[PDB]
């Protein structure tokens, strides 16, 4: 197996290297935590790391890999933010002991061949206009899970549909990992942290507060019912300059084929210029 220096940041690119180190660590009683990311790390990612660090006897593995298979033609893959130096600097500051930074060739030596086919949820919301997006996400997450074999894996709640689908992956394939969702870290005004907030100009940044404002307004309006919650959120979004709403939907918490009962999730996606922002919030109807 390769070298592992505790208390320091060990960076591996070969899947076999991280697999060997992970398995060796687990066999000595350390529990392995995975935080899989596409890099361009921000305090929200750091919240995931800190959650992982809190598990007694944990060793934390952070993966950074911009996965080509969840993008389609149109420039999105090339445009994805890449800040490798800041990423690794942040991991050192947080006391992370393992970064896993695979090459595209190491992950996809045979190109696209066997893949994960998600359930019907993948064709809705974010997946509506992007039919293969979630198949790309679930395929890479499955791979990272098999390479690293963590005890627990950590995701932010901002991409809530992705998190739900990942829970479906884990249940449906009987994966022996616990999925931990971490509540969304926010800027002071309430804006959900995102690696894509950097693409908001000052005017768009100002207007972007409307998403979180709309969601929180709805969460409080919800004592008066679903229609009131939805209309409160719509009013706020409508009052906001240059916010073009793509959807605003209130669903059951698992987003699945069942109606809303008392507990729901309200999800929003909107464009500000060319920048697509997402946010979501827990909703209790009538209310709790």
Residues assigned a catalytic role: 45
Q: Please give the helix or strand (H or E) that residue 278 lies within, else none.
A: strand 275-284
CB 43 within 8 A of CB 193: yes
Our finding on whether 162 is near ligand FG3 (CB under 6 A) is: yes
- Please list every residue from 213 through 272 that binds ligand FG3, using CB under 6 A: none
Judge whether 66 is annotated as a binding position.
no
Q: Which is nearer to ligand FG3, 102 or 136 (CB)?
A: 136
Q: Which does 19 bind (CB under 5 to 8 A by kind): ligand FG3, its own copies, none?
A: its own copies
Distance CA 40, CA 195 (A): 6
Distance CA 181, CA 183 (A): 7
Q: Which does 251 bind (CB under 5 to 8 A by kind): its own copies, ligand FG3, none?
A: none
CB 93 within 8 A of CB 5: no
Q: How far is the CB of 184 from ligand FG3 (least distance, A)?
A: 5
Q: Which does 147 bind (CB under 5 to 8 A by kind): its own copies, ligand FG3, none?
A: its own copies
Tokens 């998403």 -> residue: 211
Distance CA 250, CA 258 (A): 12
Q: How far is the CB of 248 from its own copies (least distance, A)?
A: 26
**Cβ atoms within 10 Å, residue 178:** 13
Q: How far is the CB of 58 from its own copies (least distance, A)?
A: 20
CB-neighbour burial class of residue 260 (10 A; exposed 0-12, middle 13-18, buried 19+): middle
CB 87 within 8 A of CB 81: no
Judge whether 156 is annotated as a binding position.
yes
Judge whether 53 is annotated as a binding position.
no
Out of 48, 153, 218, 250, name the contact with ligand FG3 by CB under 6 A.
48
Q: Which is nearer to ligand FG3, 17 or 159 (CB)?
A: 159
Q: How far is the CB of 137 from its own copies (least distance, A)?
A: 12
Judge whether 196 is annotated as a binding position.
yes
**Cβ atoms within 10 Å, residue 147:** 22
Q: How far is the CB of 215 from its own copies (least distance, A)?
A: 28
Our finding on whether 127 is near ligand FG3 (CB under 6 A) is: no
CB 150 within 8 A of CB 122: no
Out of 195, 204, 212, 280, name the contact with ligand FG3 by CB under 6 A.
195
Out of 159, 243, 279, 285, name the contact with ligand FG3 by CB under 6 A.
159
For the beta sheet containing 243-252, the strands, ordered from the edge strand earlier in sequence to the opposite edge, are: 243-252, 263-272, 275-284
CB 21 within 8 A of CB 30: no
Residue 93 is encoded by which pair of tokens?
């500051």
- Residues flagged as binding site for ATP: 38-45, 156-159, 185, 193-196
Q: Which residues of this protein are in contact with ligand FG3, per CB under 6 A?
A: 36-38, 40, 42, 44-45, 47-48, 69, 112, 115, 117, 131-132, 135-136, 139, 156, 158-159, 162, 182, 184-185, 192-196
- Residues flagged as binding site for beta-alanine: 70
- Residues flagged as binding site for Mg(2+): 86-87, 90
């Amino acid at each position: 197996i390769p070298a592992f220096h505790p208390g320091e940041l060990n960076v591996y690119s070969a899947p076999g290297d991280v697999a060997d180190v992970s398995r060796a660590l687990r066999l000595t009683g350390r529990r392995v935590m995975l935080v899989p990311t596409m890099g361009a790390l921000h305090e929200g990612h750091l919240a995931l790391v800190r959650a992982a660090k809190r598990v007694p006897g944990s060793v934390v593995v952070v993966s950074i890999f911009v996965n080509p298979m969840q993008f389609g033609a149109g420039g999105d893959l090339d445009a994805y933010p890449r800040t490798p130096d800041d990423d690794l600097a942040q991991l050192r500051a947080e006391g992370v002991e393992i970064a896993f930074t695979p090459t595209t060739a190491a992950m996809y030596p045979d190109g696209l061949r066997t893949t994960v086919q998600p359930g019907p949820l993948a064709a809705e919301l974010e997946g509506g206009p992007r039919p293969t997006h979630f198949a790309g996400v679930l395929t890479v997450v499955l791979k990272l899970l098999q390479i690293v074999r963590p005890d627990r894996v950590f995701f932010g709640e901002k991409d809530y549909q992705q998190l739900v689908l990942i829970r479906q992956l884990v249940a449906d394939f009987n994966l022996d990992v616990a999925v931990v969702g971490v509540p969304t870290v926010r800027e002071a005004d309430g804006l959900a942290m995102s690696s894509r907030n950097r693409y908001l100009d000052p005017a768009q940044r100002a207007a972007a507060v409307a998403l979180s404002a709309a969601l929180t307004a709805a969460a409080h309006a919800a004592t008066a019912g679903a229609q009131a919650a939805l209309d409160a959120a719509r009013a706020v979004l409508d009052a906001a300059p240059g916010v073009a709403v793509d959807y605003l939907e209130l669903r059951d918490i698992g987003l699945g084929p069942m109606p809303l009962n008392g507990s729901g999730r309200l999800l929003v996606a909107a464009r500000l210029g060319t920048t697509r922002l997402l946010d979501n919030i827990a909703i209790e109807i009538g209310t709790f």
